[PDB]
Amino acid sequence: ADVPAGVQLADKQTLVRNNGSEVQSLDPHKIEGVPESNVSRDLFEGLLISDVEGHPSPGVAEKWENKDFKVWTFHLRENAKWSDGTPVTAHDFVYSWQRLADPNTASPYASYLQYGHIANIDDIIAGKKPATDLGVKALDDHTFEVTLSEPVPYFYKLLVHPSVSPVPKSAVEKFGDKWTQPANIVTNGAYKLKNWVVNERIVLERNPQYWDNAKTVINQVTYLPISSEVTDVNRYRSGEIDMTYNNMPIELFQKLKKEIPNEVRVDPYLCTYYYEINNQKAPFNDVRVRTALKLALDRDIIVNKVKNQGDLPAYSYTPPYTDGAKLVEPEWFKWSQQKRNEEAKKLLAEAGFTADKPLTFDLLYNTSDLHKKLAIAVASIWKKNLGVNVNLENQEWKTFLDTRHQGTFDVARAGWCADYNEPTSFLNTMLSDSSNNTAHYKSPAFDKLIADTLKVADDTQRSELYAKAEQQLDKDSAIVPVYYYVNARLVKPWVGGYTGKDPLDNIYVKNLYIIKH
Numbered sequence: 001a002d003v004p005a006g007v008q009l010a011d012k013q014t015l016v017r018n019n020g021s022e023v024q025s026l027d028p029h030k031i032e033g034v035p036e037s038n039v040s041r042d043l044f045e046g047l048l049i050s051d052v053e054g055h056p057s058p059g060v061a062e063k064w065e066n067k068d069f070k071v072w073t074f075h076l077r078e079n080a081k082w083s084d085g086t087p088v089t090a091h092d093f094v095y096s097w098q099r100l101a102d103p104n105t106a107s108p109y110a111s112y113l114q115y116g117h118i119a120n121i122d123d124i125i126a127g128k129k130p131a132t133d134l135g136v137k138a139l140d141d142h143t144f145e146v147t148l149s150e151p152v153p154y155f156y157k158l159l160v161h162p163s164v165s166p167v168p169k170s171a172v173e174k175f176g177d178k179w180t181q182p183a184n185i186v187t188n189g190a191y192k193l194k195n196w197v198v199n200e201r202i203v204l205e206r207n208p209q210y211w212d213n214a215k216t217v218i219n220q221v222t223y224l225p226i227s228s229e230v231t232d233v234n235r236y237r238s239g240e241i242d243m244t245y246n247n248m249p250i251e252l253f254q255k256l257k258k259e260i261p262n263e264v265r266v267d268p269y270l271c272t273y274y275y276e277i278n279n280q281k282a283p284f285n286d287v288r289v290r291t292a293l294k295l296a297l298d299r300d301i302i303v304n305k306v307k308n309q310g311d312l313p314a315y316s317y318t319p320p321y322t323d324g325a326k327l328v329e330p331e332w333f334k335w336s337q338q339k340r341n342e343e344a345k346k347l348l349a350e351a352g353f354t355a356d357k358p359l360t361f362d363l364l365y366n367t368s369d370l371h372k373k374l375a376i377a378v379a380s381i382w383k384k385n386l387g388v389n390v391n392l393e394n395q396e397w398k399t400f401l402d403t404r405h406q407g408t409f410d411v412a413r414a415g416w417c418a419d420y421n422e423p424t425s426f427l428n429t430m431l432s433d434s435s436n437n438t439a440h441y442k443s444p445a446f447d448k449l450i451a452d453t454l455k456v457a458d459d460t461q462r463s464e465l466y467a468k469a470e471q472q473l474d475k476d477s478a479i480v481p482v483y484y485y486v487n488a489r490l491v492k493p494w495v496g497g498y499t500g501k502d503p504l505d506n507i508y509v510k511n512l513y514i515i516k517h
C-alpha cells in the first residue's frame with residue numbers, strides 16, 4: 001500500500017470484505033470465479049500482478065524480456081519467498097504450469113495455457129504428451145522461460161490471473177486435496193490463511209515472508225460468503241463489513257445513492273451479463289430457438305427499469321470497450337422490441353412451438369437476490385413477449401459452476417469478466433475445446449476466425465477478426481447478451497487505496513489501508 005502523506009492510519013488495520021459466496025476452492029488450479037480470485041490474489045502471487053490501477057506490473061518477476069513475442073524470459077526477484085520462508089523459484093512455476101496443463105488436474109482453466117499458446121499445450125490437454133513436455137523451463141532458480149508456439153504480443157497481460165500463480169509442490173504432494181487447509185497450506189502472496197470456516201468466513205493474516213511485506217498495511221482481512229445482496233448491505237451499514245461484494249440489491253440501490261453517495265462506488269467493468277444457452281441440448285441446438293430467446297428479451301426493460309444501476313444493454317459477448325474491441329452493432333439491436341418480438345415469435349412458430357405445445361425449460365441461476373429478481377423479470381418478459389414458460393432454479397455458486405460444466409441444464413444466467421484486457425480474454429472461452437466453454441458451443445467457423453488472429457501480425461486485422469468472430473457468435477445465437485456490467489459496490493470512507501480505475505477489479509488487500517476514524 002502507498003499511504004498518502006497526511007493520512008492518519010487507524011490503530012487496528014483489519015478489513016472485512018463480503019465475497020458473494022463460499023469459494024469453490026483455494027487451489028489456484030481448481031478455480032474459475034470472481035469470489036475465488038478475490039481470495040487467490042491475496043494468497044498466491046504469479047509472475048506479474050495488477051498495480052492499484054490495473055496495469056500489469058512486477059509480481060514475483062521483477063523484469064522480463066521477449067524474443068519475437070514467442071520466447072518470454074522472466075527474471076524472478078531474489079527475495080521472493082513462501083510463507084514458510086522457502087524461496088519462490090522458477091521451478092515452482094515450472095511445476096505449477098505443468099500441473100495446470102495436466103488433464104488429471106481437471107482445471108477449469110487448463111485452456112488458459114492454450115490462450116497464451118504455450119508450446120505443446122494441445123497435446124498435453126489431449127493426453128498425447130506428458131505435462132512435462134510443456135514449453136516452460138527454469139533456466140536457473142530465478143529465471144523462468146516460456147516458449148510459445150506463435151507470437152503473442154499481449155502474452156504478459158495474461159500473467160496476473162490466478163491459474164498461472166505458483167502452488168507449493170511439497171504441500172500438494174504430501175496432503176493432496178487437503179493441501180489448502182490452514183494447517184497445511186503454504187502461500188506466497190501478501191497474506192497467509194489463518195482460518196477457513198465453510199459458509200462462515202475465510203480469515204487471512206499478513207505473510208511476513210512476502211517480499212513486499214514492508215508496504216503491506218492491513219494485518220488481517222476476512223472474506224465472507226454472503227449471497228444475499230440485501231444482507232451484505234445491511235452488514236456493511238451496521239458496521240460489520242467494510243467493503244460489500246459487487247452485486248448490489250435492487251431493493252436498496254437507488255436509496256443508497258441518495259443516502260451515502262460517497263460510499264456508492266460505480267466504475268467501468270469489463271464483464272458481460274448474459275443468459276448462457278446449453279447449445280448441445282435439444283431444443284437449444286436449434287438456432288431458431290436460441291435466436292427467439294435472444295431477440296424476445298427486452299434489454300431496455302431489464303437494464304433501465306429492473307436493475308437501473310448504470311449497466312449498458314448488450315449485443316455482444318466481448319464488452320465493446322475492451323482494449324482492442326471495434327465491434328459492429330448488429331441490426332436486430334436497432335430494431336424496436338416489437339419488431340424483435342415478432343421475429344422471435346415467428347421463429348418459434350417455425351420451430352414447431354404452439355400455444356398447445358409451448359417452449360418450456362429451466363432458468364438456472366446462482367443463489368442471489370439480484371439474480372433471482374433478474375430471472376423473474378426475464379421469465380415475465382419471455383412469457384409475455386414470446387409465450388415461453390420457464391422454471392427458475394437456484395443453486396449455490398460452486399454447485400452452479402459444476403452444473404454448467406456438466407451440461408446438466410437448459411439456460412443459465414451467466415457473467416464473464418475479463419482475465420486480461422484484450423478481446424480473446426472473452427472470445428477464447430467460446431472455442432470448441434475451451435475448458436471455460438460452459439455454453440457447450442462448437443463452431444469450426446468461430447474457431448478458425450480466432451486461430452487466424454495470431455496468424456496476422458497487425459492489430460487492425462486482429463480487431464476485424466474479433467469483430468467477425470462476434471458476428472459468428474451472434475449469427476449462431478450462442479448466448480443471450482443482456483448487459484455490460486458496471487462495477488457497483490459500497491466502500492467505507494475509511495478504506496483507502498481502492499481507486500475504482502481497474503476495469504478488471506483485480507484488488508489486492510496489500511494495497512489498501514484503514515484511515516483513522
Ligand code: IUM
Nearest residue numbers: 153154457458459
Ligand atoms: O505488438 U503491436 O501492433
Ligand code: IUM
Nearest residue numbers: 153154457458459
Ligand atoms: O507496447 U504494444 O503494439
Ligand code: IUM
Nearest residue numbers: 154323324421422
Ligand atoms: O492500453 U493498450 O493495447
Ligand code: IUM
Nearest residue numbers: 360361362409410
Ligand atoms: O426443462 U429441463 O432440463
Ligand code: IUM
Nearest residue numbers: 230249251369373
Ligand atoms: O430482500 U429480497 O427479494
